[PDB]
């Protein structure tokens, strides 16, 4: 009569896998090269080529469309809106989240989406480059470091994290634990219960710590390679929001939508 925490494990990874419209498995069968193959953008022409595709309305304006750095900053956007919708569903499988009071459960994902989506982009990155708009687009890293300033410095940070963090070759089931502890952290500003998070915390990582050490049994140090990768994480998004301040501040037409400048509103 004890818990079972391999099962718990299966659990969250089968929320994972139902929950989020991209995996590791997914991406990686784009990236290796048949229908709806990936249109590459490497520059000013291939990006619009590939708006006036797959984001056509985006592009419809005329002399009235936005300069391209705020298009792709507000494709951006679109994705976190969407990611952040399916985090909250998964975080439903997580044992205990359900059962906190919602403004604590508003705080916990206030907090871990985005260290959650810099975690998953990490899946769909690779030294040259980018998954985009649900696999039907390749972005290159260097297209991407030619953007005009301020720009040009959204993505390299998250490419330095993901080439780190996909050296140490986690998969979905891995990922889908990481994802969950990431949401549990019992130190985030401003929670109300924070010994019922602190519990929960405590089981979800228990789970990720037996399961890490079965599936990498060749790799002893990879639980607190990944407790480091976690504290990196709220350190990139610390630095993410300052810079998405200067940018909504400075940059008259990059607006922010509203579901993001709430969860930004009093972050950092
Ligand atoms: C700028 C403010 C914005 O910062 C960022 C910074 C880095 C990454 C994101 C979200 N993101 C990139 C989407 C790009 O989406 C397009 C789409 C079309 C296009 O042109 C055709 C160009 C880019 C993404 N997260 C994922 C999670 C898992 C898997 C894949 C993922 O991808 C937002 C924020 O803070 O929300």
């Given amino acids: 009569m004890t818990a079972d925490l391999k099962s718990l494990a299966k659990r969250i990874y089968e929320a994972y896998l139902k929950n989020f419209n991209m995996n590791k498995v997914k991406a990686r069968v784009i990236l290796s090269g048949s229908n709806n193959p990936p249109f590459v953008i490497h520059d000013m022409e291939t990006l619009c080529m590939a708006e006036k595709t797959l984001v056509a309305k985006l592009v419809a304006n005329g002399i009235q469309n936005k300069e391209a750095e705020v298009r792709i900053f507000h494709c951006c956007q679109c994705t976190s809106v969407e990611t952040v919708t399916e985090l909250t569903e998964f975080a439903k499988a997580i044992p205990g989240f359900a059962n906190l009071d919602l403004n604590d459960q508003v705080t916990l994902l206030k907090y871990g989406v985005y260290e959650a989506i810099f975690a998953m982009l990490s899946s769909v990155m690779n030294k040259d480059g980018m998954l985009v708009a649900y696999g039907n687009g390749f972005i290159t890293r260097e297209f991407l470091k030619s953007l005009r300033k301020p720009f040009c410095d959204i ?96 940059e008259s037409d990059a607006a922010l939508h509203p579901l993001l400048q709430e969860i930004y509103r009093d972050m950092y």
Avoid: W, Y
């Fill in 155 to 250: 993505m390299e940070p998250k490419f330095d994290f993901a080439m780190k963090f996909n050296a140490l070759e986690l998969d979905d089931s891995d990922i889908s634990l990481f994802v969950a502890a990431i949401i549990c952290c019992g130190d985030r500003p401003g929670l109300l219960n924070v010994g019922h998070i602190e519990k929960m915390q405590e089981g979800i990582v228990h789970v990720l710590r037996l399961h890490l050490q079965s599936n990498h049994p060749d790799d002893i140090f990879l639980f607190p390679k990944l407790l480091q990768k976690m504290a990196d994480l709220r350190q990139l998004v610390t630095e993410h929001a300052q810079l998405v301040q200067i940018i909504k501040k400075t």
